Structures are given as C-alpha cells and as structure tokens.
Design a protein around this ligand. Sequence first.
Ligand SMILES: [Fe+2]
Ligand SMILES: [Fe+2]
Ligand SMILES: [Fe+2]
Ligand SMILES: [Fe+2]
Lengths: 419, 419, 419, 419
Amino acid sequence: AELKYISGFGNECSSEDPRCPGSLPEGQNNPQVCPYNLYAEQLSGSAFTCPRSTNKRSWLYRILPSVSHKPFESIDEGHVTHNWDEVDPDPNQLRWKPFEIPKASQKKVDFVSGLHTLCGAGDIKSNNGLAIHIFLCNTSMENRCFYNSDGDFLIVPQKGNLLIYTEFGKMLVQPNEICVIQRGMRFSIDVFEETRGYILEVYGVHFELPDLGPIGANGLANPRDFLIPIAWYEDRQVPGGYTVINKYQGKLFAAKQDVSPFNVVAWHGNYTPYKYNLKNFMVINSVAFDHADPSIFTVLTAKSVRPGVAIADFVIFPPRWGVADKTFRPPYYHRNCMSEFMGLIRGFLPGGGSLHSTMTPHGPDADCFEKASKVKLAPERIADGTMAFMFESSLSLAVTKWGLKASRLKSHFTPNSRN
Amino acid sequence: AELKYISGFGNECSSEDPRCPGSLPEGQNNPQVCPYNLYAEQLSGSAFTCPRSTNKRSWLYRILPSVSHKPFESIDEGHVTHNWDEVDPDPNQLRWKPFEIPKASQKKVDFVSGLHTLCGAGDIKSNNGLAIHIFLCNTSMENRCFYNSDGDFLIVPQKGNLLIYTEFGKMLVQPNEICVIQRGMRFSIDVFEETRGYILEVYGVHFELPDLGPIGANGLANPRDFLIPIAWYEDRQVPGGYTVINKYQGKLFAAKQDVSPFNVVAWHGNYTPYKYNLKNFMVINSVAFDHADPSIFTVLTAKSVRPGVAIADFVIFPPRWGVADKTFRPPYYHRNCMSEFMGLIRGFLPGGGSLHSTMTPHGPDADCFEKASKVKLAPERIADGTMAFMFESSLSLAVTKWGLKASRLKSHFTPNSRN
Amino acid sequence: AELKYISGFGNECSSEDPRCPGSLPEGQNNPQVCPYNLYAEQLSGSAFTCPRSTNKRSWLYRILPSVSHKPFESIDEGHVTHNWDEVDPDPNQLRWKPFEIPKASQKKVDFVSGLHTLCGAGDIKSNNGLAIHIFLCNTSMENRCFYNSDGDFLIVPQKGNLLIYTEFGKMLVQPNEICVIQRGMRFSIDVFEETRGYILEVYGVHFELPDLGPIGANGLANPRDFLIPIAWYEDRQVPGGYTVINKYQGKLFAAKQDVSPFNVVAWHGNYTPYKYNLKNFMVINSVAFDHADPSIFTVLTAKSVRPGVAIADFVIFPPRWGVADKTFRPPYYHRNCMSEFMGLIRGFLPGGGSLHSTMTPHGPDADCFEKASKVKLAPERIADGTMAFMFESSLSLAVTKWGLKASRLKSHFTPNSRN
Amino acid sequence: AELKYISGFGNECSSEDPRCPGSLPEGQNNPQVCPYNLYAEQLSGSAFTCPRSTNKRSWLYRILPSVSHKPFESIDEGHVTHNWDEVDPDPNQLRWKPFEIPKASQKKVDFVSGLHTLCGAGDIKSNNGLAIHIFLCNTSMENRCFYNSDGDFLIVPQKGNLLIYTEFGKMLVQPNEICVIQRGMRFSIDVFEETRGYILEVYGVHFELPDLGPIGANGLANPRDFLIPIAWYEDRQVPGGYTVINKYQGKLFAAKQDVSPFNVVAWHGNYTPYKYNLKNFMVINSVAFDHADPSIFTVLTAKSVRPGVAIADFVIFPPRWGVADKTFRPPYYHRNCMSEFMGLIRGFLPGGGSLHSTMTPHGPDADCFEKASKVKLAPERIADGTMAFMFESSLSLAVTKWGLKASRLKSHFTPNSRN
Ligand SMILES: [Fe+2]
Ligand SMILES: [Fe+2]
Ligand SMILES: [Fe+2]
Ligand SMILES: [Fe+2]
C-alpha cells in the first residue's frame, strides 16, 4: 500500500497515528500525564535562543523515552572517515566509474555497513564542514537503526529504492527523488536490490530553500512539493536487543535497547525528515541569449554565516528547453572558488562522479566545443531522461584513501579578422 | 456542525474542499487547464522579491476570477476615518464606557456599517501607520463582503460570536479568541446578537510571532495553536448582485458582481486568515521577585524596520499565578515612549477602554498602592475569569472626532528612616 | 558624429575632456590650484557616513563653481504636482490613450514645460515617495537646464529621441533605451520632433541593480551595458542669462547665471548620469513549466529599508522564447499588495498606460483565457517588436487631477469531473 | 575590611585609587606627562574598528608599563591541555564525583598549579572554541600572577572563597557568585582553605548579557548587579622577581619582573574584570502551564556569529516558585544539538558534574517520572538552598585524558484509552 505524506517545507506540523486519535496533548506540550500515557520528548535542532526563522524543534509523544538504552560501545568505522589529511592534496580532476555494489551472494551488507566516505573538508566538532559519502549495500537493516550526532544527511538514491523508517513515520525514496534526515533523527532503511547512492553530509547546519531573488515568490523547488512522513509507530520488543548505531564526532557507536525506537505515537514541530521529487522542479533559465550560471538550478542550500556563501549547495540539471540564440549553449570554460562534485542519477555513467577542485580549470571538451560552435540554433529538448546533479562547496574538498583507491582543443584565432 | 481547521502559524498550507478531491494542480501552480476547469489566481501579500522568511502569497483555484465585477463606486464612509488632525491633540488619559451597540429594533446594522474608528496614527498610502476601530452591529452581512486594500485586521470580539466567511474557508471566532484577516482578503460576517468588539488595523505590514529570546523554543503563543480555515466554496448566483465593499486608501467603495466571492474550491500558500484562542497562551512571568514588563505577554507583533520596535503589538493579561516575594505585584508607575490602548474582553467594564498617550504618567491608584504595599505575600491566582489586553504602538495615537464624542495618593517619605 | 561612453554600473570613474589632458588633479582631490586653474566642486549623492557600498559622490573640476548664479525665483509649476489629496481615491483600473503631444504650430513647449505628473505617493521632504510623470514637448531647451533637488529620474523615451546635456557629458537616449539622472544633476534636453515619454521619480533614494539570487553572477541587466557619458565642456557666456530650473520640495524655481552650467572640464566619482539599452537585457524565465512572476524581469530597483521591498521597481517585458509545457502562458489572475503602472514603448497603444491599484483584481480577459486554454503548446516567440514595462511600487499611488482629466468571462466548472 | 565596587555591566568606567586623587588625565588619554608621572597603557579587548556596541578597551595609568619584564620561558603545562584528540570520542553521559582537592599537608598547590582541563572543543589560535577547567588548590598565589592570552574566563567557585587581585582592583568572589576575567588581564588569587571550582573558558570572544526578547527591559541578570573593582595599586619591588604566568596558544609560560603588576594607580574604560551574585537573578518562568526551556535561565552568553547561536552560555537553576498546573514539572526528555555540562555549587554532589553530549538522549529517571506524574499539583518552592548550573555549547565537547581518569523506566501505554 502506498504512503501518505504531509506537505510544506519548514512547516510547523502535527501528526497522530490514525489508530490513536488525540494522542497529541491539547493546547500544551507537557501535560502531567500525556494522552494514552505516553512520554513527551523534545528533539532540539537549533539552539533554544534562535529567532523564529531558524528555531527548530519537535515534540515526540512516545511509548518509551529514548533514554532507555544500554551504554554505547565503539564499533568498527568501516569506510566512514573524516581524516582529510591521510592522503596528500591533488588538484587534478578525479572521475569515478559507477561504484561497485557488493553482491548478497558474496557479502550481506546493509546501508550502514556499506557507507563509504568519498571526500570532505572541515572540522566535525566545530560545525564547519561537510562530507560526501557513497552507500553500497544489498540487504535491509534488521533490528538496527542509525542516527547522526554530527549533522544532516541529504540522501540521493541512484540505483535501488529506499524504504525509510524514521521516528516521524515512513518514506519511500526512489531514484530521481531525494530526502533529508536531520541531525539526531534515528532511521532504518529497507532495500530491494543491490543498492547505490550518494549522501551529502553537512556539519552542524541545516538545509534551507534558497531565497529566490528576482525569480520572486514561485519557482525552482516549490515548498508544497516537499513531503514529510505521517506519524506511524510500532510497539515491538526485540529479543536480543534492537541496535542503535550512532555517528558521534565521526566515529561509530552501538547501543542496545529493548524495543524498536520507532514508537512515536504522535509528534508536532518543524524539525522533521522529508523528501522531494526532482521532477517537480520548476526550471528557470535563459530564454533570449547567453548561458545561465548553474546556481540557477539550486534545490537546497546549507548556508554559511557569510551572506550568499553556502557550506554546500545541492544543484540539479533537469529536463528543459534550450532556446538561447547566438549563444554557446554548453557549459562555459570555468575556474571557480568552490569545489564541484558531480553525480548522475540516470564522462561517467549513472552512479559514478567527478570532482573539480578549487580553481582547477574545467569546461567542455574539443568535440563539444566544435559541435556547439557550428549548429544552427533552434529550440531543443535538453537532459530528457537524464538527471545529473552537483554538490558544490565553499570549502576545498579532500578525497579520502578509499576515494582514491576507487578512482580512475585547438586555437582558431584570426588576429586580423574580428567578424 | 463544528468547523475543522488546519494548524500552524505561517505554514505553507494546501486545502481542497472535500467535495472536489484533487482540485489542486499536481506539481505546479499554473496548468493550461486547472483541475475541474477552475481559474488560478494569485494573492500576493508581499513584494515578489522578499526573502523566504517574509515572502507571502496564496494560489486560489476558483470558479470565476475576482476580476469579474462591475466598477467600484464610492459609498459613504460612516464612522471609518483616518483624518488624525480634525481633533486637537490631548495628552490626558481617555476612558470609554462599553460602547453602545445599536438595537435591531432601532437600526439594522451589519459589521461594516457599524465600524467606528477610535484612534490612529500614520499615513495610509505609505505603509506606516495603524488605526483602532470598534465594531457595533446587530445583523449579519447579507450578500455583502468586505476587504481591506490598506492593511491587516486583528479582530477581537468582546460581546457576540463572529461566524466569518473568507475565500479560504470559514472561522467561528468567539470572545476570548482573536482572528487576523490580512490585506486584500474578502470576508463576510454573520452575528447572532447585539455585537461589539475591537479591531487593530496596521498599514502595509503583517503580524508575526515575536522572537522568544531567552524564553527559547516554546512558550507564549505556540505556533500549533493558530488555526487556519479549511477550503470551502459556494457556487451561488446572486439576483441583484453580490456587493464587495472595499477599504481603499481609507475610503469605502462598493462593486457589484454576479456571484458570491467565496467560490474558491482549493487553495495553497502561506498567506491566509487565522484565529487563535487566548486560553492557550503559555504564560511566562516572574517566579522569585520583581514585576515583569508587560511585553512578556506579547501575542502578535507588527514589526517596524527598527529592530525590536513594533508598529503595533497585541498583548494580553491572562489568568496566571502571582508569586513574586518582597515585591510590589501591581503594575509599576510608568511613563512610556509608546501609546497604550487598553481593552477588556471579559476602571472600565468589558467592551470599553483607555488610552495612555506617549509619556503621560500612569500607574496604580491610591487604594491599589495601599493594599499591595501591606498584604502578606503568598502564591495567588490573578486575572481568573477576566481577559484584558493592550494594543501598544510606537506611534503617537490621535483620537478621532467620534472617539472623543464617545469618551468620558500620599507621600510616605521618612527622610531619616531607610529600613 | 556619435558619442562615446564609459561602461560599468556604479563604477568609480575618471573622465577628462580630450582637449584638456591632465585636467584631473593627480593623486588628490583638492589641490591648492587645480590643473588649468579650475575649481573643484563635490556633488554628494549620499550622506558622508554611508558605507562603501552606498557612498556616492563626484568631484567636478569646472570653469566656475555652481555658486555663481543669481537668487532663485519661483516660477509657475504647470502640471508638476505632488498633492496626492486633491483627487478622491479610486480603486478602479485606469487606462490612458497615448498622451497628446502639443504641436509646435500651436505652442512651442520644451521638456520642462511639458512635464505632467500622472500619479504618486509619499512625502517629498522625507525621502519616502515617488511620482510618475509624462513629458509632452516639441522644442529643445534653449539656454535652460533642469535639476531635481528632491530625488532621481528614470527617463523612458517612447516617441522621439532625447539628446541630453549633463555636467558629466552628453547622452543620446532613444526609444527602447532608458537613462537615469540622479538628484542634483543639472541637465538640458534637445528634441527632434513631437516628443513623448515616461518618468519614474523616486524621493531621496537611488536605483541599484537587483541582487540576482539563484540567477547568480550574470543575467538580466549586466553591469557592463550601463553607459556613462564622457567629460565634455563648453565655456559659453549667455547674453541675457542662462536659466537653471530647480525642482525643490516639489515646486519649480528659476535662477539666472552668466554662463552655461556645462563647464566641467574633468570629473571623477561614482555618482553620474547613465543610460541603458533594453535590448541587452539577458532575459531569464521558465523553461519547463509554469509562469514566472514578473519580478524576474527587473531592470533597476529603488530599495526601501525593508529587505526585498522596493519603493519602486522598473520591470520590462522583452522579446523572448515562451516554452512552458502544460502551462497557462499568459499572466495569471492577480491581486497584489503593490501598485502597478504599465506603459508601452513600442489594452493601450504605445505612449499610453494603465494603473492597477493595490489589491484591485486583474488578469487576462475572456478571449485571452479561452485562446491560451486551448492552444497546442510549442516553442514560440513572444513580444517581438514590442516593449512593455512596469513601474511597480510598494506605496499606494494616487492619480493627480491632470492624470484623471487625461484618462478613459464564464464559469467552466465541472464539479463531478476532475480530469 | 570589605571591598567597594562600581556597578554596571559593560559601562565605560573611571577609577582612581583614593590615595592619589586626579591620577586620571583630564580630558585626554595621552598627556605628554601623565599626572603623578605615570605611564599610559592601553589594553585592547577588541579590534580597533569594532562598532561602538562591541569596541572594548581600557586605559591603565601605572607606575611601570607591562613591557618591563624579562623574556618568557616555557614551564610545564600540568593538566592544562587543549588536545581534544588524545582520547577517542564517547557519546555516553559522563559523571564526576566532587573532584579531589589536594591537601596542603601533601602538596602545596596554588590556583594555577591546580588547573585541570576537563573538556573542550575548537581551535585556539582561530578564536573558535572553549574549554572547561576545574581548579583544585590549597595555597594562595605568592608573587605570581596569571593571564590568558587566548580568551576569557568565567570563574565559578564551589568550595572556598577567592580573593582576587587584578590590575583594576580586588574582588572577593564567594560560592554562589561568579566573576569574569577577560583576555589579557593579569590576576592573582588568595585562597583560605582546600579550594575547588569550575571555569568556562571561551576563545577570542567575550561574554554579553542576553537580549531579553519579550522579557523586555528588566529581568534575569540586571546590569546593575554586575560589580567591577575600584582602582587599587601597590608599588612593591619583589626580591628574586615577581612571576607572570601566561597561557599563550594553550601552553604555559613564565616571565620574571622586578615589581608586582598591580601598580595601576588609575584606569578608565569598558574592558574590566567583574563579578555577579547569583542570588540577584530575577527568575523568569512559566506561571500557568507547561515547562519552560532552560535557556530562560541564561546569565551570560558568548555569542557566535550565527544569530542566536552561542559558543557557550552560562545558565543557572535558582530558588524559585514552581506553579505550572496540569504540567509535568521536572525537565522533559531531551535530545539536543548542543553539548550540556552541568555543575553544582551547593546524580552528583556539589563540586562534581555531568556531560550530556550532542544528541545523546537524556531526561528524568523512573522514580522522578513516577512521582511527578502522580502528585496533586500546587504552588511549591524549588531549588531552595541549592544552586545548579550549566555550561552549554554549540560545539561538541570532547573530554581530556585527565577528565576521563577522573570520571565514574516502563511503558504505560493504553492504546485503546486516550483520556
Ligand atoms: Fe564549474
Ligand atoms: Fe504602561
Ligand atoms: Fe499584477
Ligand atoms: Fe537537555
């Protein structure tokens, strides 16, 4: 059966499992005894003193508070790392073939076990950084959940659907859709095949919709298309213990508890997981001449404190009309102060990627330059049946050891002839 | 039958009349042909270029666009005025007995006809001002709606319930509740008895929830308690014409149309009417010593461009515990840079009011000073069964002609004895 | 012969008349004796204490300082007015046929004499307002210049070229181009036929290029396309006196002087007149679905202190591709918090206009709705050979007396059928 | 005899030792020869270009300038450290029994020698971090002073009074009082018994009073209750050299000089040490229903550049009335984006503490939940005779090696019964 959702990016939402009407306290957050005898638990996504525009928190009315668990124990990190200095810097463009997914025949690997950090920058405990990870897995998480104490996750499936269980409800996230799981939120993922995808992790900050500037009040990723799960719970005891995996200061820890963490009967707040279908992106671009800068395709942004400068932006290159006359339509040659990671949902193949590091020259190849400089221009369809994206950062990304192991024009100048 | 509502102050909402599921365009705002063959209409509450935090607009999917109406014609203003200079200034405190409601036996008077401006300040076309009005009526509006082209209305019923029809749906607003009808929104009101109330009108700005400062993430007027109407429409032809009343640049105009304006089948956006029950106010105050400044009871604020300075604030004095030890519990003597209008929902009686003008001294009377200076202090209940409020402004309010026609301690110093 | 220009919106420029090389003081602004024995004069466009981003001033090295003139004398205002209250408010849309230009045979009328205020709002001495004027003239200004002590002028010729003399040099401004003459700048205009155009005047503020938001670093009105005049002077004595016309606090004054005011041999600064050709506008719009808000066509903006809210914006509707699929391409039905004045450079004819006042409903007519709801959609050319524009303001414009003397859909709802 | 003080948080103060009236230069800061032949020395607490609201500096008129000292020499760091990575991360809550104070019989230990860093985060040279230290000592500092080149110290005595000598005068700081010694200020401390306390150190930033938001103009820590020392000097030569200890980039250095550094005869400025008595805190909380977020008890805040986000906040839980009806009065269950260090001035005992790391669940225990869910609610006294506090940070604190060596609920859900 298919899941229902609440819509509205950043909304102050209220949701009760349909089986327990009125589980949300009426007119208050902390009754002496909560309806149905539940426990009230607050998840604070921002400092308490943040202004209305940035204050984030959710109240969870659950069967047992999250404190009921045994002590965390250190587990092996696998390929999740934040040591940006084990590998010497390298300005050259890097390219990756679609990352290899392990076969279930060979090794049963769930989403957490198949998490591999590709590159990143910044300090984790300081709320200034990011990391890009690739998930390669083939089995559903069983009696195991995961939460990130360090920051937020923008998850981008490429091959394989994700059925995601969160304390706020469930989300089905398919390729060409994305979802965000914010700091502290426990989640579990069921897969249905050899699965591969990308994850943009930002330290201590949250994603927002970009101010539209001249675009105005509508356009790009409309708020209404962001979908939030409806409350759903399970009161399930787990023989042998349910395991909660914790990414804390970049290391992984495991804590056993008696029941599943998804026992939230009702919740309200503006700090929740969410998903978005990329096909709903209202594409804005040039309709007369010239080529628009790629920031015009920004979906979500994790703002730095410097005005207009992002820690990390999520940008997409969707199906659209190309109509610019007397214009070089392909991407212009470019040297940029930002790092540019590029992925492909559906030259690399879907599931691979490239990294253009800061100020390293890039641009179209000889064949693309030649073809675009000669074609009679007319309205054409671009990117149909494809979906490329970019994670761009203001920091200088550094590839990890694993990231490295996994990796791979003529002059026409007529001095005397202007026209 | 009782009305259902959507909750969440400032939320980006979606609502479809239950009779027409899927009337909202899927994944876009402007289909060539809207579901059910409706018209798409945008109501912009803010300039298009406002940042995400202040950009307000709603999309209405309706039977006929609002353009289908005959030309506006000037009608008599009655007691609605914005001429702040017909009456000479007067710094003295003014007091009003409960305003007289006209008897239906004598004159049938609807909400618009019984609108009387009490005081105000500022320029209307410039988006810098406010006006306080009193409504005195006894009959429902019949085939007549009202909209304010100049600003927003914070409506506070005192005697008599208000059944309010808006393009976004219906709201029942009873004494001890308030509702806001924002600029441009057409509305109609049914009454059920001789009716009286107060209206705070702010020019060209909108009300927001105050930043909580140290109070944090919860408290005062929680976002969840703000209620927005669910979509409701009527496809009703009106023999003789439905009349739309327009307050434009302070004057009143009337335009006839063939159908009722409440033909909005579905709508989405973050610019909507709303209501709030004052009893849900999570009261914050002093719990050790001293007397807290009244701004601690702020419900809604219409911010000026100067940080922390409001054009107009709505403040309430609700039922609460008074526990301050070694403290003068009543209001302190005060001279203030702001004008203070005071009303009473349930010395004046419910439905009357007072105006303390800028820097004019005010404070408790002799009997109140004497009683509070002597009582053995202990935890006590304050304001139970009562609800006083204040409209305070940074401008200097001036009473109107009508406002004027309607209107009405010992030294104990022991120089040589400290303790 | 055709004029040369310096390019770069807001640049800190330096210009010397070619006949007097080195007329600009080297390495300083105030030598004891300026090169060529000129006088140094500073024109301050902003308070001295404005930050770098808003500090505007120019140094003029001239033959005689502007102080050498006789006392100003009041002259007749003509049709230039700022009394927004002589005419009762009216919310109805107003429309104007192309304004009538006086024939030279009948009355010789220069640019200043043919200045007629159409509408406006705000207070003049307070730096918060605007006025829209129409110029109807047929003769060049002879030994007569004009300067505005109250604010800036965005001039939009419609019929007839303008040859404009300013202290900073000359500009030829033709229909489909615009120019800005900032506060305090003296100017004179030669015409070549019966001339008509529009003027957007903003009180005490200056126009800026809009922040591009997601559009990025390039697009809309590129800085390079803004053209500034190169220094040019004339040392010309005027028998009988040269007349300087002054718009001061909305009234007109005349002061005689011995020489032409355009005796500036060299100048440097970032406060200058400028022009822009509308054809260079890099048009941004929707390239997949839906209809973009008109703010996406903003050329120049006179910002208010409220973030994202403009006092007045200049918006154009240029030649472009229309490619939105499954979309109602024409303007959506709309009710707006801003006033909208519309003009046409090349339903009204070029040189006329319309005024949609605040919150008054507007949108496409029946025939336009019907045609656009039925056409098979495909890439098409829009606005070719035409140029419509809008002066939109956050204030509520009021038409003047002269402005007034000069002035002039079915339900398809299928309740039971969604798709 | 008891010390006198000047009052007023952040005031621009002037103070002269009573023995030398007129030691402050009249009408200037840098006379050629200062009164009494003193030297003028400026201590800059902020960059010179900071706006009025953040510009901090003090002028010291002293017997000898601070330059007269021999070269600094590295001394052993002891237990003062800033290496956050010698110890592997651990998300589990940590708890500390009251830290052991060394007996004078065993080892004479002064305040500097008994300084032990518990936990911290951030980079020292970059002005983005904090450290929490515990001082365990038993002897007064003799001919030895200390200054912090890296940041500010908020000192919280727990056991034992502190008599503190600073260049600005002396302060007596007792348990239940706190004092702040800002960056660069030299100080010495006399103790009177086995002494223990806590120190919150913030890198490159200063503490401010929190904006009150709705609380208004008075409340919490009133400015008047902050006490600053009055000028006091000693002209004392020290045989063998007076030793100045310097915390520079986290390491300790020692420089000998001929005289005591407390030879400041007069001083003026707004950058001074200060103290505050916690009993004067005007406690604000809920007086109707629900439980207020702990930020409502903020005393001082070291702001980050992100609005509303602090580097570190100092929060207290003082004696107050608890009156919330139909409310769970104890702390709610919580998962927070901030680290929370908790101490107790007068489950742990006074002088111990706990660390709830980022997003690790916490909340009341079973016995506290049970008791609070059942009690008939009525006005009660809370925290009388106790004083707990919290150092909360936006960074993720990491415990040091020493910090580690020193360290140590049922479901009631009735699915079918709401009410
Ligand atoms: Fe690039
Ligand atoms: Fe007052
Ligand atoms: Fe419009
Ligand atoms: Fe907590």
